[PDB]
Amino acid sequence: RSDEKRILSNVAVLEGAPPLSEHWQLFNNNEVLFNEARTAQAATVVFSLQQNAQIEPLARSIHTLRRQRGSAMKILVRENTASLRATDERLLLACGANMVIPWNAPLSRCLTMIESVQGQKFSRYVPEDITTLLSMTQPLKLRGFQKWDVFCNAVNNMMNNPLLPAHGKGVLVALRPVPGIRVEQALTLCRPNRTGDIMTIGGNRLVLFLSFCRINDLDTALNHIFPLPTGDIFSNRMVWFEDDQISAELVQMRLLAPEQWGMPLPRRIPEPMRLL
Amino acid sequence: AVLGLQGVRGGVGTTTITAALAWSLQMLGENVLVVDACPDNLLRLSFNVDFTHRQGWARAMLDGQDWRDAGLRYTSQLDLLPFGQLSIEEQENPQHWQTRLSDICSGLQQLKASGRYQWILIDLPRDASQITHQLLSLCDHSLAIVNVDANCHIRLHQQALPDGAHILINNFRIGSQVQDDIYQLWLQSQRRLLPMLIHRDEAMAECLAAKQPVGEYRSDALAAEEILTLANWCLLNYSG
Amino acid sequence: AVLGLQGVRGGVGTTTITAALAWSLQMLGENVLVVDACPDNLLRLSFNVDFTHRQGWARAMLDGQDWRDAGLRYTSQLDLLPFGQLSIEEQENPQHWQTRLSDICSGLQQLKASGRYQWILIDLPRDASQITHQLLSLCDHSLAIVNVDANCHIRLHQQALPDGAHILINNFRIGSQVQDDIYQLWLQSQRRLLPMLIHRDEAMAECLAAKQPVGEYRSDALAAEEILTLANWCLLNYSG
């Protein structure tokens, strides 16, 4: 309408480049930018993500902006350093951000993306309650080894949650160890790092569930988890990442009788000689 | 002023790093002179010097001529002093000329005191020769180039680096477990390790084939950015 | 036969290839003596020898002792002869001991004439010293270790390979355009190029960290199989 051409942006969005046009205003942090955008109607607001701790206040600011100000406003989050997860990006999109620009894209790509959102309106629904959006960041809250029943119950509870992305809740992996090493030794060589990762052993298999991991980025997660390369420890791998597949595997895992389950268990030296 | 780059082991990338650092320093506005002290004479080929150009400071001193006429100008702020091509017989018996190259110390002292050059990079070999010791003695600062591998890890515990030398990492791979272990151990143990390292980049492999420094060959490459960071570090720390 | 392995430059993999070749030859049933002539003394570590073990033939001859006592028995078909540890003063002053090691040539000749060892592998540096030349003259055959890069392409055109030496390629990488171009040129220009090449395999990087030869450390690695192919080629072609 009046400030459609206006582009309210953070200083760090431009890595020292001058204001590209007359319609650019540069702010120091994403607080004065929020206050100035409160008065704006159809402008473009380009935040900046430097560190991980900024996601929640930024989500609150985006939520307030998309609620008080309608669908005309364009909200962009320019990520400057690798300080974001897929779940956080989903949260920011849900709160009312048009799109999140990755740090991999250089400045020119970011400017083209800013041009991309012009003339567009935010038609997605933003819920009034903000806590129900933050609750979707990590719904499991359980780490490490779990017994078979507890593991199955936790994963099944996660699958039945309606406030979670479809087919993107996590990955269920069944690992069959190579002959010569038991499943308990594989469990010892297994140190999940995140809060939503759980492991269990049963029937000569090691079963993992990685929360919100995508199927493509599964080898990276496994490399983080295990100390030795994955491939010298296990012979075969079965993966379920769709909701129907995970549910079917869980209901096929509950019909495993106990006594088949498991719990953690409590070089040549050269010698001198005379050559002759 | 005088910055000597020496490799803990051959093949680590001392020559290409020296050429790239000279290019970055001259891009930052510094007058740079590169001296090739390695008898193999490979630094000249990174500055578009023909392979048949036998002249150099060492060859001039051996033939009795003046080494000041053996200098080459690349840009207005970058000068090159090649070693010169030695014959096969000279390479086979290095002891016949290793003691005849002493005046280069006085010449480098004169160039340092002249003030025409703000940086004098010296590409030093690793042969424990007398000339290399003298050139290291006249160097104000030293950079030891290593690769993250078992060989350099062993060498850092059994051979003496130049006093005050800082260790620079080159040929850093992605997804190498043993490399990661050695790198973490160095971060927690090596006090002289610089905060900057150079990743294995195809640009550094192609720059010598294109007869250009990596900054000139491909300024957008990651190794060029890392060399620029190293040049900024040298300007901020090794200036005085 | 006495086989001497040398590299056109440091860091090509001569010590690792020497250890792997010795292991593969002893795996085929051939008695092997592996001799390190490099003063860096890094070949002993591939055979689980302690770092603090300072005994070696060069240190034996520099202390007035007998150099035969410094041998080590790794397997029943493999003996190791370390160079020995040199102090920092001796490392930085190579002229005071490089002329005193000449006694090794007669001993190596008598070891060859004894007939106990069917293969005597020598790891040679490229320091252009008297000992290197003498030991390389003692070699019945020799291998030149190169990597496919611009540095080795330049070196092969400006330095003399040993007479009759064959070129062995190490650290053959994946997805390097310049490497492919240089290898295409070498397939036509180079006549002493061996038909087998070693790849850039993480097993070779890890073997020295585990203080084992690559065949012992990881027998399913491609590098171990290629070293076995090299050993078969040496049996068929370097028998006498």
């Binding site: 100390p227 070089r267 | 078992a150 890890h153 062993i154 850092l156 515990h157 003496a160 680096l161 043993v178 272990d181 050695i182 973490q184 151990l185 927690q188 143990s189 090596q190 006090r191 002289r192 | 570590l45 689980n48 302690d50 770092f51 890890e206 020295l208 960290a209 585990a210 203080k211």
Partner: peptide, 29 residues
Amino acid sequence: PDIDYADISQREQLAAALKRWPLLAEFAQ
């Protein structure tokens, strides 16, 4: 060179790395 191997066993990742590779462990003692 300046080598500081004191208090090297107080970190889990370094302990695992030293366990895996005998060379690093041999140097770190």
